[PDB]
Amino acid sequence: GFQKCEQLLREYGQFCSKINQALHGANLRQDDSVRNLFASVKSSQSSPIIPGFGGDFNLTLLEPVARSAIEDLLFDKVTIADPGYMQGYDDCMQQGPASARDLICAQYVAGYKVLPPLMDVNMEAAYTSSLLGSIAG
Amino acid sequence: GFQKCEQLLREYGQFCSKINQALHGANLRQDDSVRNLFASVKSSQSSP
Amino acid sequence: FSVDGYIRRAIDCGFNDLSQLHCSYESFDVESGVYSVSSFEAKPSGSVVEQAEGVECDFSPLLSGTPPQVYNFKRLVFTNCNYNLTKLLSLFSVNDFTCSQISPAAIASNCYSSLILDYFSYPLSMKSDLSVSSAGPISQFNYKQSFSNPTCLILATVPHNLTTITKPLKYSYINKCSRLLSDDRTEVPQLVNANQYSPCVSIVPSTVWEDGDYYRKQLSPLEGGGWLVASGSTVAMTEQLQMGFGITVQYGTDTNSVCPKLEFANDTKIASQLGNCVEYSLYGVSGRGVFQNCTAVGVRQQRFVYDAYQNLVGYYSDDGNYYCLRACVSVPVSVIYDKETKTHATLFGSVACEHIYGPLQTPVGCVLGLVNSSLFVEDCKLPLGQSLCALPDTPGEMRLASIA
């Protein structure tokens, strides 16, 4: 925010334009990657998943509880900082940093932002759920 | 080995920590790559 | 610029978020998409100041008796006091006052951990020998200023009516200082370190009797053995005594309690502005942030609590309270832009609408300019994240649609 620095920063040409455009392009690539991948995992036809799916073969850890039990366990066992997609701005003011070197609250201090993914959790689960129901057939 | 330089080097933050950690990670990746590759070339059965 | 050079169309790059987008691409035509732009900056709504308020810095010793020679300079170290340079300078006829690694405006207005004042008798005719570039007797054997700290050098003449300062018979200095090693063949010059006294000070008397006087001391084995030798030289005394004053200031070895005298108002207190973005100056430590009342952490006696990134994150106030200090966090801004319709909407990612058709709260932050439609799409061109999409009305306002 210092005007004196900004004056000097201008002597380096369109530096920030290049930073912003490069990251914008990278972020679009990530969305295209996801859109393309899920378009291909998507089944054209699938059987409904019902409790008991698998018969003698116990697949209850794959059935949606919605995410599956193994899927929830995988996420719960991994240490991930919550980016606060809906209101992280407020959480970091009212509660503050979770710990030392909190890289999520640093967003609004350092001047960077973590963007949300192209798909929410329920949609991603919908794709792997319908994929499960297509395997046998 | 010059103490005067080291004093100035500290003004650049944990520079050497980043260099060392990056190369350490790369070197571990190479060992994981080899271990994985050879695990797969390995035959379960073979003739003498 | 048109072909004929006239300006017919322009963008004010700071007007709004869409304008920022066009300026970053240097174009009046940009593609549809969701773009990050500069955050909405928080501005200070006030300021808080805390300084030591009390005793002034005492320059009295300086004004009484015969000042020392340049190699015997006396040092006054000021901490925990209110300083005023004018109050010292106004007593002398200042011939030269120059600063290094600190502005002239700053030397009289900044807060310091400490201020060190080195004063001595010094002929003005040798002015140049106090320069950092000098290789003469003074910078080599008598007095040298620090290279690492900001310094000022003042040369001034004592007025005829300032009768509390008396004169020496002559000015004197060391023109030689060296050691003769135990072999008695090799002579090693002993140069003075910045802010220190020459090792020959112990053999050279307070006043050199005659120019060319030679001094020697036998050194003990504990001192490396050999001899310490020196020669002195003199300058005839002037009508009015000329003095040098070296000022060295440090900016962060302690609470910066050496400050200008400030008259305080009760609108610059912390307790009265909690929760607000303010500019602060706390014993020389400054910046912008938000103070909150919270549980005391760290050592109380150390006053300032820092995090792992060396930011100030807490402060013990003289009012007895401990405050948490948060940065004046800015509000994220993203432009949702449709090139075909020339319409847009603003997304404030991760922000509740409490800080912003009016604002609409979505799973990715607060949006302004989108209308909730409870409509589904598959063919989304302007994804907002999660499973949200901005859907142009075609023009009207963009609709907020879900991805099916």
Add this chain to the structure above:
Amino acid sequence: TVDVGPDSVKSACIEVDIQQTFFDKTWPRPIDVSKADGIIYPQGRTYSNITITYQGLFPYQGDHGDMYVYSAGHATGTTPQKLFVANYSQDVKQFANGFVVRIGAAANSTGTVIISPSTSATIRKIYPAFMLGSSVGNFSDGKMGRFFNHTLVLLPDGCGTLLRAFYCILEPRSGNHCPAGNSYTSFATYHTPATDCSDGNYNRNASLNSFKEYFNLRNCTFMYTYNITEDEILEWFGITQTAQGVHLFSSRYVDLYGGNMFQFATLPVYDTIKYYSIIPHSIRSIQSDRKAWAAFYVYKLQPLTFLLDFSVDGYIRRAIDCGFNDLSQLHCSYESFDVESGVYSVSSFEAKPSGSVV
């Protein structure tokens, strides 16, 4: 100049018996940086519940330091005789960057009464006395330990209830057993508990007055006193010097039960301290009332990088000396006391010059 009271009026000093053999003990207490021994707290700030590296003046990990012990003097029944000291006054050390002192570490343990090895007693804390200056040499009889020009003396007094710091010229007295007289061995300070350590009124000038028997105090620029509450708690003391003067550090005013040292005083001593020595102290107790006194340990400081673990309350309880060994280097490079298993490259063992060619 500062008035520091009258000169001693005695024509003679108390004879000092130097028997270093009795003080040649091996009671090692090396710096254990994992307990944050000898650490001077970051001076202008505090931190809470983080681990960071920090550049500052620290003792080396594993440094045994120099051990010094004070003892009871000679006595026959109820009459004290001559003093009994170690050869500390002639043992002049280089000051360098200053030092830290471990004081009272052995307190409460059963130890030996140095003057009488067969006799044991509960160990009590005693404070160290120091003589510091820019120039040293010999006394009239050739013995080393004389300081020239202004000398800084840190002399605890009042049976350990005050620290007196003064910067003055020490002019050796010429009386019997005094440094400029006949039959001189060593100067020493002393107190006589029988008259000086009353339960109520302690003699706050006992060690100063004994010091004055050996030296006249001339051209004193200051004399400061600091109050010490009596206890048997292990404490740390430190001394450093900068352009601002001599900084005195102590744990007892901020971290009494911890050991982190905080600055408590700055002395207007601007000449460079190059040398220091321990002023020997001997307690003139009666033969039947000898105490065992804790040894103190002096450790040198140097500009090192340490990894410092700050507790929620800001105190340093654990640290790493980053240059001690290769494992320490590893923890410092990750700024953590917890690093993963693996094989890590660290700084090479540097070769040092064993000479020079010209």
Add this chain to the structure above:
Amino acid sequence: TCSQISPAAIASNCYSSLILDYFSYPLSMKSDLSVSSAGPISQFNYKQS
């Protein structure tokens, strides 16, 4: 003396403008026109760009 321009250049280069500020000034106060000066002249009277 010149600053941020060579002595050879000051007399030979082309400029958009040249601004000449003239005044009476004792030579005895020469040093107080220095950029490093913290005396009365650089603080309250005249300062160069």
Add this chain to the structure above:
Amino acid sequence: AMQTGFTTTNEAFQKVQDAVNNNAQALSKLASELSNTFGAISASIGDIIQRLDPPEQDAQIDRLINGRLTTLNAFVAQQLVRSESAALSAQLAKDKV
């Protein structure tokens, strides 16, 4: 047997945590580099302006600018590398499905 398999001996699981850690490292670069002075008297532009006049002030600010520009370039370069890497990897996932 897989229900309790998310441990330190599970390489696939650890790779999941590593991917998460790589995201954190990318952000730690931006967050921690702002405390560096890069040879300047302070990491705070406000302090530099507070203490120095323009002919020296510019030099100190310029040190911070070059340091920060370097950091941002390094950050972007790694995001581009990591992004490309992930994009390739997304194709591989497509093939495995």
Add this chain to the structure above:
Amino acid sequence: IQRLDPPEQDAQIDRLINGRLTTLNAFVAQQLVRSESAALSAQLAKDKV
């Protein structure tokens, strides 16, 4: 250090530091690129075996 005093000495050392820091960053970046490249390539070898 042999030739200059601190105010200039720092500037000269700082040039060497920035040059060497740049070199090390470039080195590391290429090792990371070459390492990633080889890792991909190791997978390809796996597939060919």
